[PDB]
Amino acid sequence: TMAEKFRDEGRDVLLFVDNIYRYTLAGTEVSALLGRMPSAVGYQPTLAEEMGVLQERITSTKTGSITSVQAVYVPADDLTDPSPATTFAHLDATVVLSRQIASLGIYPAVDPLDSTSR
Amino acid sequence: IIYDDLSKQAVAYRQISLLLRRPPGREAFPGDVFYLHSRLLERAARVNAEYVEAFTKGEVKGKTGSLTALPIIETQAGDVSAFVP
Amino acid sequence: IIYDDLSKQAVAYRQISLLLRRPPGREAFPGDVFYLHSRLLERAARVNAEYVEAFTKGEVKGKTGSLTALPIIETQAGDVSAFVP
Amino acid sequence: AGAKDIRSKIASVQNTQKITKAMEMVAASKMRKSQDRMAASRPYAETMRKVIGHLAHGNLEYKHPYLEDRDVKRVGYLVVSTDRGLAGGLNINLFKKLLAEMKTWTDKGVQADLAMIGSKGVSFFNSVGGNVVAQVTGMGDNPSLSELIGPVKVMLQAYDEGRLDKLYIVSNKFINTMSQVPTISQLLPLPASDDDDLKHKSWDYLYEPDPKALLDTLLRRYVESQVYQGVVENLASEQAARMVAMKAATDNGGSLIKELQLVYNKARQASITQELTEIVSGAA
Protein backbone atom coordinates (compact mmCIF):
# COMPACT_ATOMS: atom_id res chain seq x y z
CA THR A 1 0.00 0.00 0.00
CA MET A 2 2.93 2.43 0.46
CA ALA A 3 4.02 1.57 -3.05
CA GLU A 4 0.47 2.19 -4.30
CA LYS A 5 0.68 5.67 -2.81
CA PHE A 6 3.89 6.33 -4.67
CA ARG A 7 2.27 4.97 -7.85
CA ASP A 8 -0.54 7.51 -7.63
CA GLU A 9 2.04 10.22 -7.88
CA GLY A 10 3.04 8.84 -11.29
CA ARG A 11 6.42 7.45 -10.29
CA ASP A 12 7.95 4.16 -11.40
CA VAL A 13 8.34 2.40 -8.07
CA LEU A 14 10.19 -0.79 -7.15
CA LEU A 15 8.87 -3.13 -4.43
CA PHE A 16 11.04 -5.79 -2.76
CA VAL A 17 9.58 -8.75 -0.91
CA ASP A 18 12.34 -10.49 0.96
CA ASN A 19 10.74 -13.90 1.10
CA ILE A 20 7.42 -14.57 -0.59
CA TYR A 21 7.64 -18.12 0.75
CA ARG A 22 7.37 -16.81 4.29
CA TYR A 23 4.27 -14.90 3.26
CA THR A 24 2.80 -18.23 2.16
CA LEU A 25 3.84 -19.88 5.43
CA ALA A 26 2.31 -17.12 7.52
CA GLY A 27 -0.91 -17.72 5.62
CA THR A 28 -0.68 -21.43 6.42
CA GLU A 29 -0.11 -20.80 10.12
CA VAL A 30 -3.06 -18.38 10.27
CA SER A 31 -5.30 -20.78 8.36
CA ALA A 32 -4.47 -23.56 10.81
CA LEU A 33 -5.15 -21.21 13.72
CA LEU A 34 -8.56 -20.42 12.29
CA GLY A 35 -8.97 -24.16 11.85
CA ARG A 36 -9.81 -24.51 8.16
CA MET A 37 -9.25 -27.84 6.48
CA PRO A 38 -5.77 -28.41 5.07
CA SER A 39 -5.26 -28.72 1.35
CA ALA A 40 -2.77 -29.93 -1.22
CA VAL A 41 0.42 -30.55 0.72
CA GLY A 42 -0.85 -29.18 3.99
CA TYR A 43 -1.17 -25.64 2.75
CA GLN A 44 -4.25 -23.57 3.38
CA PRO A 45 -7.17 -23.97 1.00
CA THR A 46 -7.03 -20.29 0.02
CA LEU A 47 -3.39 -20.50 -1.13
CA ALA A 48 -3.96 -19.61 -4.76
CA GLU A 49 -6.07 -16.61 -3.75
CA GLU A 50 -3.95 -15.32 -0.90
CA MET A 51 -1.11 -15.21 -3.41
CA GLY A 52 -3.22 -13.69 -6.17
CA VAL A 53 -4.58 -10.83 -4.08
CA LEU A 54 -1.00 -9.73 -3.37
CA GLN A 55 0.60 -10.38 -6.73
CA GLU A 56 -2.21 -8.73 -8.67
CA ARG A 57 -1.87 -5.28 -7.09
CA ILE A 58 1.66 -4.76 -8.42
CA THR A 59 0.99 -3.90 -12.08
CA SER A 60 1.42 -0.94 -14.36
CA THR A 61 -1.41 1.52 -14.77
CA LYS A 62 -2.35 4.49 -16.95
CA THR A 63 -0.81 6.70 -14.27
CA GLY A 64 2.30 4.82 -13.12
CA SER A 65 3.70 1.46 -12.27
CA ILE A 66 5.12 -0.81 -9.61
CA THR A 67 7.77 -3.34 -10.46
CA SER A 68 8.63 -6.04 -7.94
CA VAL A 69 11.69 -8.14 -7.08
CA GLN A 70 10.84 -11.15 -4.95
CA ALA A 71 13.27 -13.49 -3.26
CA VAL A 72 12.02 -17.06 -3.54
CA TYR A 73 12.87 -20.17 -1.53
CA VAL A 74 11.77 -23.53 -2.91
CA PRO A 75 11.09 -26.23 -0.31
CA ALA A 76 13.01 -29.50 -0.57
CA ASP A 77 14.36 -28.21 -3.89
CA ASP A 78 10.98 -29.22 -5.32
CA LEU A 79 9.70 -26.97 -8.10
CA THR A 80 6.42 -28.90 -8.06
CA ASP A 81 5.54 -28.13 -4.44
CA PRO A 82 2.35 -26.05 -4.32
CA SER A 83 4.09 -22.95 -3.01
CA PRO A 84 6.59 -22.50 -5.87
CA ALA A 85 4.04 -23.82 -8.35
CA THR A 86 1.70 -21.08 -7.25
CA THR A 87 4.34 -18.38 -7.16
CA PHE A 88 5.85 -18.96 -10.60
CA ALA A 89 2.49 -18.51 -12.26
CA HIS A 90 2.94 -14.78 -11.50
CA LEU A 91 6.67 -14.31 -12.19
CA ASP A 92 7.74 -12.66 -15.42
CA ALA A 93 11.51 -12.90 -15.20
CA THR A 94 13.85 -15.07 -13.19
CA VAL A 95 17.51 -14.43 -12.34
CA VAL A 96 19.49 -17.19 -10.65
CA LEU A 97 22.58 -16.32 -8.67
CA SER A 98 25.45 -18.78 -8.54
CA ARG A 99 28.17 -19.61 -6.05
CA GLN A 100 30.45 -20.67 -8.90
CA ILE A 101 30.22 -17.49 -10.96
CA ALA A 102 31.10 -15.64 -7.77
CA SER A 103 34.05 -17.86 -6.88
CA LEU A 104 35.42 -17.14 -10.34
CA GLY A 105 35.55 -13.52 -9.17
CA ILE A 106 32.69 -12.27 -11.36
CA TYR A 107 30.05 -9.96 -9.94
CA PRO A 108 27.10 -9.88 -10.18
CA ALA A 109 27.00 -13.65 -9.92
CA VAL A 110 24.06 -14.12 -12.28
CA ASP A 111 23.98 -17.49 -14.01
CA PRO A 112 23.31 -16.59 -17.66
CA LEU A 113 22.18 -20.11 -18.50
CA ASP A 114 19.54 -20.53 -15.80
CA SER A 115 18.30 -16.94 -15.81
CA THR A 116 15.25 -16.39 -18.00
CA SER A 117 12.67 -13.81 -18.90
CA ARG A 118 9.40 -14.29 -20.62
CA ILE B 1 -15.11 -22.00 -26.95
CA ILE B 2 -11.72 -22.01 -25.18
CA TYR B 3 -11.48 -22.65 -21.45
CA ASP B 4 -8.23 -21.00 -20.51
CA ASP B 5 -7.53 -23.15 -17.45
CA LEU B 6 -9.64 -25.96 -16.14
CA SER B 7 -6.79 -26.51 -13.69
CA LYS B 8 -7.57 -23.14 -12.11
CA GLN B 9 -11.27 -23.90 -12.06
CA ALA B 10 -10.58 -27.15 -10.29
CA VAL B 11 -8.41 -25.32 -7.78
CA ALA B 12 -11.14 -22.76 -7.11
CA TYR B 13 -13.68 -25.55 -6.66
CA ARG B 14 -11.30 -27.25 -4.25
CA GLN B 15 -11.13 -24.06 -2.24
CA ILE B 16 -14.92 -23.72 -2.13
CA SER B 17 -15.32 -27.36 -1.23
CA LEU B 18 -12.81 -27.31 1.62
CA LEU B 19 -14.32 -24.14 3.05
CA LEU B 20 -17.59 -26.06 3.19
CA ARG B 21 -15.74 -28.77 5.22
CA ARG B 22 -16.42 -31.52 2.66
CA PRO B 23 -14.14 -34.57 2.93
CA PRO B 24 -11.45 -34.37 0.24
CA GLY B 25 -10.24 -37.23 -1.92
CA ARG B 26 -6.94 -37.60 -3.78
CA GLU B 27 -4.70 -34.54 -3.95
CA ALA B 28 -7.10 -32.88 -1.53
CA PHE B 29 -9.58 -32.59 -4.40
CA PRO B 30 -13.25 -33.13 -3.61
CA GLY B 31 -15.09 -36.29 -4.50
CA ASP B 32 -16.98 -34.79 -7.44
CA VAL B 33 -14.06 -33.12 -9.19
CA PHE B 34 -14.84 -35.42 -12.09
CA TYR B 35 -18.51 -34.51 -12.23
CA LEU B 36 -17.39 -30.88 -12.19
CA HIS B 37 -15.62 -31.08 -15.54
CA SER B 38 -17.92 -33.78 -16.89
CA ARG B 39 -21.10 -31.80 -16.74
CA LEU B 40 -19.23 -28.90 -18.36
CA LEU B 41 -17.45 -30.52 -21.27
CA GLU B 42 -20.39 -32.75 -22.05
CA ARG B 43 -22.08 -29.65 -23.43
CA ALA B 44 -19.67 -29.22 -26.33
CA ALA B 45 -21.73 -31.27 -28.75
CA ARG B 46 -23.10 -31.44 -32.25
CA VAL B 47 -26.88 -31.69 -32.50
CA ASN B 48 -28.93 -33.15 -35.33
CA ALA B 49 -31.47 -31.14 -37.27
CA GLU B 50 -34.50 -32.63 -35.54
CA TYR B 51 -33.25 -31.35 -32.21
CA VAL B 52 -32.76 -27.88 -33.65
CA GLU B 53 -36.30 -27.85 -35.02
CA ALA B 54 -37.75 -29.10 -31.76
CA PHE B 55 -35.83 -26.56 -29.72
CA THR B 56 -36.43 -23.48 -31.84
CA LYS B 57 -40.11 -24.22 -32.53
CA GLY B 58 -39.68 -24.90 -36.21
CA GLU B 59 -38.01 -21.57 -36.88
CA VAL B 60 -35.03 -23.39 -38.42
CA LYS B 61 -34.90 -26.37 -40.77
CA GLY B 62 -32.10 -28.71 -41.81
CA LYS B 63 -29.24 -26.91 -40.06
CA THR B 64 -27.19 -28.74 -37.43
CA GLY B 65 -25.58 -26.69 -34.69
CA SER B 66 -22.38 -27.43 -32.84
CA LEU B 67 -20.22 -26.13 -30.01
CA THR B 68 -16.50 -26.93 -30.13
CA ALA B 69 -14.38 -26.79 -26.98
CA LEU B 70 -10.61 -26.60 -26.46
CA PRO B 71 -9.99 -26.89 -22.72
CA ILE B 72 -6.48 -26.08 -21.52
CA ILE B 73 -4.83 -27.99 -18.69
CA GLU B 74 -1.51 -27.19 -17.02
CA THR B 75 0.57 -30.09 -15.72
CA GLN B 76 3.54 -30.08 -13.39
CA ALA B 77 6.90 -31.25 -14.74
CA GLY B 78 5.29 -32.77 -17.81
CA ASP B 79 3.43 -35.28 -15.63
CA VAL B 80 0.51 -36.49 -17.73
CA SER B 81 -0.28 -39.01 -14.99
CA ALA B 82 -1.49 -36.65 -12.25
CA PHE B 83 -5.04 -36.69 -10.93
CA VAL B 84 -6.79 -33.85 -12.78
CA PRO B 85 -4.89 -34.14 -16.08
CA ILE C 1 -7.56 -74.12 9.25
CA ILE C 2 -6.95 -71.71 6.39
CA TYR C 3 -8.40 -68.21 6.75
CA ASP C 4 -8.47 -66.94 3.20
CA ASP C 5 -7.79 -63.19 3.16
CA LEU C 6 -7.74 -61.90 6.68
CA SER C 7 -7.09 -58.74 4.65
CA LYS C 8 -10.82 -58.79 3.86
CA GLN C 9 -12.01 -59.54 7.34
CA ALA C 10 -10.10 -56.41 8.27
CA VAL C 11 -11.92 -54.45 5.59
CA ALA C 12 -15.35 -55.65 6.68
CA TYR C 13 -14.50 -54.73 10.24
CA ARG C 14 -13.36 -51.29 9.12
CA GLN C 15 -16.70 -50.74 7.44
CA ILE C 16 -18.57 -51.82 10.55
CA SER C 17 -16.48 -49.54 12.73
CA LEU C 18 -16.90 -46.48 10.53
CA LEU C 19 -20.65 -46.94 10.38
CA LEU C 20 -20.77 -47.12 14.16
CA ARG C 21 -18.74 -43.88 14.19
CA ARG C 22 -15.79 -45.22 16.12
CA PRO C 23 -12.64 -43.05 16.00
CA PRO C 24 -10.54 -44.10 13.01
CA GLY C 25 -6.82 -44.81 13.18
CA ARG C 26 -4.22 -45.15 10.45
CA GLU C 27 -5.61 -45.82 6.97
CA ALA C 28 -8.99 -45.43 8.69
CA PHE C 29 -8.73 -48.81 10.34
CA PRO C 30 -10.13 -48.82 13.87
CA GLY C 31 -7.53 -49.17 16.61
CA ASP C 32 -8.47 -52.62 18.04
CA VAL C 33 -7.86 -54.44 14.70
CA PHE C 34 -4.72 -55.83 16.26
CA TYR C 35 -6.82 -57.25 19.06
CA LEU C 36 -9.13 -58.44 16.30
CA HIS C 37 -6.58 -60.68 14.68
CA SER C 38 -4.63 -61.38 17.86
CA ARG C 39 -7.47 -63.17 19.59
CA LEU C 40 -8.36 -65.03 16.44
CA LEU C 41 -4.92 -66.41 15.66
CA GLU C 42 -3.92 -67.15 19.26
CA ARG C 43 -6.52 -69.92 19.24
CA ALA C 44 -4.30 -72.00 16.96
CA ALA C 45 -2.51 -74.17 19.49
CA ARG C 46 -1.26 -77.58 20.52
CA VAL C 47 -2.66 -78.69 23.88
CA ASN C 48 -0.99 -81.28 26.06
CA ALA C 49 -2.63 -84.58 26.87
CA GLU C 50 -3.63 -83.46 30.34
CA TYR C 51 -5.81 -80.63 29.07
CA VAL C 52 -7.51 -83.07 26.70
CA GLU C 53 -8.15 -85.54 29.50
CA ALA C 54 -9.53 -82.72 31.61
CA PHE C 55 -11.79 -81.49 28.81
CA THR C 56 -13.03 -84.86 27.55
CA LYS C 57 -13.62 -85.89 31.17
CA GLY C 58 -11.30 -88.85 30.94
CA GLU C 59 -12.60 -90.23 27.66
CA VAL C 60 -9.44 -89.56 25.65
CA LYS C 61 -6.07 -90.23 27.25
CA GLY C 62 -2.51 -89.65 26.21
CA LYS C 63 -3.27 -87.70 23.07
CA THR C 64 -2.47 -84.06 22.35
CA GLY C 65 -4.82 -82.00 20.25
CA SER C 66 -3.63 -79.41 17.80
CA LEU C 67 -5.00 -76.67 15.55
CA THR C 68 -2.81 -75.25 12.78
CA ALA C 69 -3.59 -71.95 11.08
CA LEU C 70 -2.47 -70.57 7.71
CA PRO C 71 -3.97 -67.10 7.37
CA ILE C 72 -3.54 -65.40 4.01
CA ILE C 73 -2.79 -61.72 3.51
CA GLU C 74 -2.57 -59.57 0.38
CA THR C 75 -0.09 -56.71 0.01
CA GLN C 76 -0.37 -53.90 -2.51
CA ALA C 77 2.78 -53.46 -4.58
CA GLY C 78 4.83 -55.72 -2.34
CA ASP C 79 4.44 -53.16 0.44
CA VAL C 80 4.74 -54.92 3.79
CA SER C 81 4.69 -51.70 5.83
CA ALA C 82 0.90 -51.33 5.78
CA PHE C 83 -1.30 -51.53 8.85
CA VAL C 84 -2.73 -55.02 8.45
CA PRO C 85 0.32 -56.79 7.01
CA ALA D 1 7.53 -47.05 -3.83
CA GLY D 2 7.11 -44.68 -0.91
CA ALA D 3 9.68 -41.99 -0.22
CA LYS D 4 12.02 -44.24 1.72
CA ASP D 5 12.53 -46.67 -1.14
CA ILE D 6 13.06 -44.09 -3.84
CA ARG D 7 15.54 -42.10 -1.80
CA SER D 8 17.54 -45.27 -1.29
CA LYS D 9 17.56 -45.89 -5.03
CA ILE D 10 18.62 -42.31 -5.73
CA ALA D 11 21.50 -42.77 -3.31
CA SER D 12 22.64 -45.96 -4.99
CA VAL D 13 22.53 -44.44 -8.46
CA GLN D 14 24.57 -41.45 -7.31
CA ASN D 15 27.13 -43.89 -5.95
CA THR D 16 27.16 -45.63 -9.33
CA GLN D 17 27.84 -42.28 -10.93
CA LYS D 18 30.85 -41.81 -8.66
CA ILE D 19 32.17 -45.19 -9.74
CA THR D 20 31.87 -44.54 -13.44
CA LYS D 21 33.38 -41.08 -13.22
CA ALA D 22 36.41 -42.50 -11.44
CA MET D 23 36.77 -45.17 -14.10
CA GLU D 24 36.63 -42.53 -16.81
CA MET D 25 39.45 -40.61 -15.14
CA VAL D 26 41.61 -43.72 -14.74
CA ALA D 27 41.09 -44.83 -18.33
CA ALA D 28 41.86 -41.32 -19.55
CA SER D 29 45.27 -41.43 -17.89
CA LYS D 30 46.08 -44.97 -18.99
CA MET D 31 45.32 -44.00 -22.58
CA ARG D 32 48.03 -41.34 -22.45
CA LYS D 33 50.55 -43.80 -21.03
CA SER D 34 49.61 -46.58 -23.43
CA GLN D 35 49.96 -44.22 -26.38
CA ASP D 36 53.41 -43.21 -25.11
CA ARG D 37 54.33 -46.90 -25.08
CA MET D 38 52.75 -46.98 -28.52
CA ALA D 39 55.11 -44.33 -29.78
CA ALA D 40 58.10 -46.07 -28.17
CA SER D 41 57.87 -48.95 -30.69
CA ARG D 42 58.22 -47.20 -34.09
CA PRO D 43 62.06 -46.99 -34.27
CA TYR D 44 62.79 -50.71 -34.12
CA ALA D 45 60.23 -51.71 -36.72
CA GLU D 46 61.09 -48.84 -39.04
CA THR D 47 64.84 -49.42 -39.10
CA MET D 48 64.39 -53.17 -39.47
CA ARG D 49 62.05 -52.55 -42.41
CA LYS D 50 64.68 -50.37 -44.07
CA VAL D 51 67.23 -53.15 -43.58
CA ILE D 52 64.82 -55.69 -45.10
CA GLY D 53 64.26 -53.22 -47.92
CA HIS D 54 67.95 -53.30 -48.75
CA LEU D 55 68.58 -56.96 -48.12
CA ALA D 56 65.49 -58.57 -49.61
CA HIS D 57 64.08 -56.27 -52.29
CA GLY D 58 67.40 -54.75 -53.23
CA ASN D 59 68.92 -54.89 -56.66
CA LEU D 60 69.34 -58.66 -55.99
CA GLU D 61 67.09 -60.93 -53.98
CA TYR D 62 67.07 -64.16 -52.06
CA LYS D 63 64.19 -66.58 -52.80
CA HIS D 64 62.74 -66.48 -49.27
CA PRO D 65 59.40 -68.28 -48.71
CA TYR D 66 57.87 -65.38 -46.80
CA LEU D 67 58.37 -63.01 -49.71
CA GLU D 68 56.79 -65.14 -52.45
CA ASP D 69 53.06 -64.98 -53.27
CA ARG D 70 52.20 -68.70 -53.26
CA ASP D 71 48.74 -70.25 -53.70
CA VAL D 72 46.22 -70.02 -50.87
CA LYS D 73 44.76 -73.23 -49.43
CA ARG D 74 44.22 -72.10 -45.84
CA VAL D 75 44.72 -68.86 -43.92
CA GLY D 76 45.81 -67.94 -40.40
CA TYR D 77 44.60 -65.03 -38.28
CA LEU D 78 46.26 -63.53 -35.22
CA VAL D 79 43.39 -62.02 -33.21
CA VAL D 80 43.92 -59.27 -30.63
CA SER D 81 41.23 -58.85 -27.97
CA THR D 82 40.88 -57.05 -24.67
CA ASP D 83 41.23 -58.83 -21.34
CA ARG D 84 38.61 -56.62 -19.66
CA GLY D 85 34.99 -55.76 -20.31
CA LEU D 86 33.19 -52.41 -20.30
CA ALA D 87 35.02 -51.59 -23.54
CA GLY D 88 31.96 -50.86 -25.60
CA GLY D 89 31.45 -52.77 -28.85
CA LEU D 90 35.14 -52.89 -29.62
CA ASN D 91 35.54 -56.67 -29.45
CA ILE D 92 32.29 -57.54 -31.10
CA ASN D 93 32.76 -55.17 -34.03
CA LEU D 94 36.22 -56.66 -34.46
CA PHE D 95 34.96 -60.27 -34.30
CA LYS D 96 32.15 -59.55 -36.73
CA LYS D 97 34.56 -58.04 -39.27
CA LEU D 98 36.78 -61.10 -38.85
CA LEU D 99 33.86 -63.52 -39.13
CA ALA D 100 32.54 -61.83 -42.28
CA GLU D 101 35.93 -62.07 -43.98
CA MET D 102 36.60 -65.61 -42.77
CA LYS D 103 33.22 -66.55 -44.24
CA THR D 104 34.21 -64.96 -47.55
CA TRP D 105 37.42 -67.02 -47.48
CA THR D 106 35.75 -70.30 -46.60
CA ASP D 107 33.33 -69.68 -49.48
CA LYS D 108 36.33 -70.55 -51.65
CA GLY D 109 36.79 -73.71 -49.62
CA VAL D 110 39.85 -72.62 -47.65
CA GLN D 111 40.14 -73.54 -44.00
CA ALA D 112 41.24 -71.06 -41.35
CA ASP D 113 43.27 -71.11 -38.14
CA LEU D 114 43.08 -68.70 -35.22
CA ALA D 115 45.70 -67.68 -32.68
CA MET D 116 44.16 -65.65 -29.88
CA ILE D 117 45.62 -62.75 -27.94
CA GLY D 118 43.48 -61.82 -24.98
CA SER D 119 40.87 -63.88 -23.19
CA LYS D 120 37.71 -62.28 -24.53
CA GLY D 121 38.34 -63.55 -28.02
CA VAL D 122 39.26 -66.90 -26.52
CA SER D 123 35.83 -67.24 -24.95
CA PHE D 124 34.03 -65.92 -28.02
CA PHE D 125 35.65 -68.29 -30.48
CA ASN D 126 35.35 -71.24 -28.12
CA SER D 127 31.65 -70.46 -28.29
CA VAL D 128 31.39 -69.93 -32.06
CA GLY D 129 33.50 -73.01 -32.65
CA GLY D 130 36.43 -71.28 -34.32
CA ASN D 131 39.69 -73.15 -34.85
CA VAL D 132 41.86 -71.75 -32.07
CA VAL D 133 45.31 -73.34 -32.33
CA ALA D 134 47.13 -71.32 -29.67
CA GLN D 135 46.51 -68.51 -27.23
CA VAL D 136 48.08 -66.17 -24.71
CA THR D 137 46.03 -64.41 -22.05
CA GLY D 138 46.33 -62.22 -18.99
CA MET D 139 48.83 -59.75 -20.40
CA GLY D 140 46.51 -57.04 -19.13
CA ASP D 141 47.91 -53.53 -19.37
CA ASN D 142 51.49 -54.84 -19.49
CA PRO D 143 51.97 -56.40 -22.90
CA SER D 144 55.46 -57.75 -23.45
CA LEU D 145 57.15 -59.14 -26.51
CA SER D 146 58.45 -62.21 -24.70
CA GLU D 147 54.92 -63.45 -24.04
CA LEU D 148 53.95 -63.07 -27.69
CA ILE D 149 56.77 -65.29 -28.91
CA GLY D 150 54.65 -68.39 -28.36
CA PRO D 151 51.69 -67.94 -30.71
CA VAL D 152 53.62 -66.07 -33.39
CA LYS D 153 56.15 -68.88 -33.27
CA VAL D 154 53.36 -71.36 -33.85
CA MET D 155 52.02 -69.40 -36.81
CA LEU D 156 55.49 -68.96 -38.36
CA GLN D 157 56.30 -72.63 -37.83
CA ALA D 158 53.04 -73.54 -39.54
CA TYR D 159 53.63 -71.07 -42.41
CA ASP D 160 57.11 -72.26 -43.35
CA GLU D 161 55.84 -75.84 -42.97
CA GLY D 162 53.33 -75.04 -45.72
CA ARG D 163 50.37 -75.58 -43.43
CA LEU D 164 49.48 -71.90 -43.86
CA ASP D 165 49.55 -69.86 -47.05
CA LYS D 166 48.68 -66.36 -45.82
CA LEU D 167 48.85 -64.77 -42.40
CA TYR D 168 46.85 -61.82 -41.09
CA ILE D 169 46.78 -59.76 -37.93
CA VAL D 170 43.35 -58.45 -36.91
CA SER D 171 43.25 -55.57 -34.44
CA ASN D 172 41.95 -52.11 -33.73
CA LYS D 173 43.84 -49.07 -34.97
CA PHE D 174 44.05 -46.06 -32.69
CA ILE D 175 43.49 -42.92 -34.73
CA ASN D 176 41.92 -40.29 -32.49
CA THR D 177 40.93 -40.22 -28.86
CA MET D 178 37.39 -40.08 -30.27
CA SER D 179 37.74 -42.55 -33.14
CA GLN D 180 39.32 -45.98 -33.49
CA VAL D 181 38.71 -48.55 -36.20
CA PRO D 182 38.98 -52.33 -36.52
CA THR D 183 41.36 -53.48 -39.25
CA ILE D 184 42.53 -56.73 -40.83
CA SER D 185 45.98 -56.43 -42.36
CA GLN D 186 48.24 -58.98 -44.02
CA LEU D 187 51.73 -59.62 -42.75
CA LEU D 188 52.70 -62.80 -44.59
CA PRO D 189 53.59 -62.84 -47.39
CA LEU D 190 55.45 -59.69 -46.68
CA PRO D 191 53.74 -56.74 -48.42
CA ALA D 192 55.44 -54.69 -51.11
CA SER D 193 55.85 -51.38 -49.33
CA ASP D 194 58.12 -49.07 -51.41
CA ASP D 195 61.37 -48.45 -49.43
CA ASP D 196 63.32 -48.40 -52.71
CA ASP D 197 67.00 -48.97 -51.87
CA LEU D 198 67.93 -47.74 -55.36
CA LYS D 199 69.31 -44.60 -53.71
CA HIS D 200 71.48 -46.88 -51.51
CA LYS D 201 73.18 -48.40 -54.57
CA SER D 202 76.22 -46.47 -53.30
CA TRP D 203 77.04 -49.11 -50.66
CA ASP D 204 76.51 -52.68 -49.46
CA TYR D 205 77.02 -54.47 -46.15
CA LEU D 206 79.64 -56.92 -45.07
CA TYR D 207 77.34 -59.82 -44.25
CA GLU D 208 78.63 -61.98 -41.38
CA PRO D 209 78.19 -64.93 -41.82
CA ASP D 210 75.98 -64.72 -44.89
CA PRO D 211 72.95 -62.81 -46.18
CA LYS D 212 70.42 -65.68 -46.17
CA ALA D 213 70.97 -66.63 -42.54
CA LEU D 214 70.62 -62.99 -41.50
CA LEU D 215 67.56 -62.39 -43.67
CA ASP D 216 65.73 -65.31 -42.09
CA THR D 217 66.02 -63.96 -38.55
CA LEU D 218 65.37 -60.41 -39.71
CA LEU D 219 62.00 -61.47 -41.10
CA ARG D 220 61.16 -63.54 -38.02
CA ARG D 221 61.93 -60.62 -35.71
CA TYR D 222 60.08 -58.19 -37.96
CA VAL D 223 56.87 -60.28 -37.87
CA GLU D 224 57.14 -60.53 -34.10
CA SER D 225 57.55 -56.77 -33.83
CA GLN D 226 54.53 -55.98 -36.00
CA VAL D 227 52.44 -58.28 -33.81
CA TYR D 228 53.69 -56.41 -30.75
CA GLN D 229 52.89 -53.02 -32.31
CA GLY D 230 49.39 -54.27 -33.05
CA VAL D 231 48.94 -55.41 -29.44
CA VAL D 232 49.96 -52.01 -28.08
CA GLU D 233 47.75 -50.03 -30.46
CA ASN D 234 44.88 -52.31 -29.47
CA LEU D 235 45.58 -51.66 -25.79
CA ALA D 236 45.50 -47.88 -26.30
CA SER D 237 42.29 -48.24 -28.32
CA GLU D 238 40.74 -50.22 -25.48
CA GLN D 239 41.56 -47.43 -23.04
CA ALA D 240 40.04 -44.81 -25.36
CA ALA D 241 36.88 -46.88 -25.78
CA ARG D 242 36.49 -47.47 -22.05
CA MET D 243 36.90 -43.74 -21.43
CA VAL D 244 34.17 -42.75 -23.89
CA ALA D 245 31.87 -45.53 -22.67
CA MET D 246 32.17 -44.56 -19.03
CA LYS D 247 31.49 -40.98 -20.06
CA ALA D 248 28.24 -42.04 -21.71
CA ALA D 249 27.27 -44.13 -18.69
CA THR D 250 27.86 -41.25 -16.29
CA ASP D 251 25.55 -39.03 -18.29
CA ASN D 252 22.94 -41.80 -18.39
CA GLY D 253 23.05 -42.04 -14.61
CA GLY D 254 22.82 -38.27 -14.38
CA SER D 255 19.56 -38.35 -16.30
CA LEU D 256 18.13 -41.25 -14.33
CA ILE D 257 18.56 -39.15 -11.20
CA LYS D 258 16.36 -36.48 -12.77
CA GLU D 259 13.65 -39.05 -13.34
CA LEU D 260 13.87 -40.58 -9.89
CA GLN D 261 13.69 -37.26 -8.09
CA LEU D 262 10.43 -36.38 -9.80
CA VAL D 263 8.98 -39.70 -8.74
CA TYR D 264 10.33 -39.11 -5.25
CA ASN D 265 8.81 -35.65 -4.92
CA LYS D 266 5.45 -36.95 -6.06
CA ALA D 267 5.59 -39.62 -3.35
CA ARG D 268 6.65 -37.07 -0.73
CA GLN D 269 3.65 -34.87 -1.47
CA ALA D 270 1.19 -37.73 -1.62
CA SER D 271 2.36 -39.10 1.74
CA ILE D 272 2.02 -35.67 3.38
CA THR D 273 -1.50 -35.22 2.02
CA GLN D 274 -2.71 -38.66 3.03
CA GLU D 275 -1.22 -38.37 6.50
CA LEU D 276 -2.73 -34.97 7.16
CA THR D 277 -6.17 -35.90 5.78
CA GLU D 278 -6.17 -39.04 7.92
CA ILE D 279 -5.47 -36.96 11.03
CA VAL D 280 -7.85 -34.03 10.44
CA SER D 281 -10.84 -36.06 9.26
CA GLY D 282 -10.22 -38.38 12.18
CA ALA D 283 -11.13 -35.67 14.59
CA ALA D 284 -14.89 -35.33 15.04
UniProtKB/TrEMBL annotation, chain A:
Belongs to the ATPase alpha/beta chains family. T3SS ATPase subfamily. It is found in: Cell membrane; Membrane. The chain holds residues 226 to 343 of 460 of the full protein. Produces ATP from ADP in the presence of a proton gradient across the membrane. The catalytic sites are hosted primarily by the beta subunits. Coiled coil: none annotated. This is ATP synthase subunit beta.
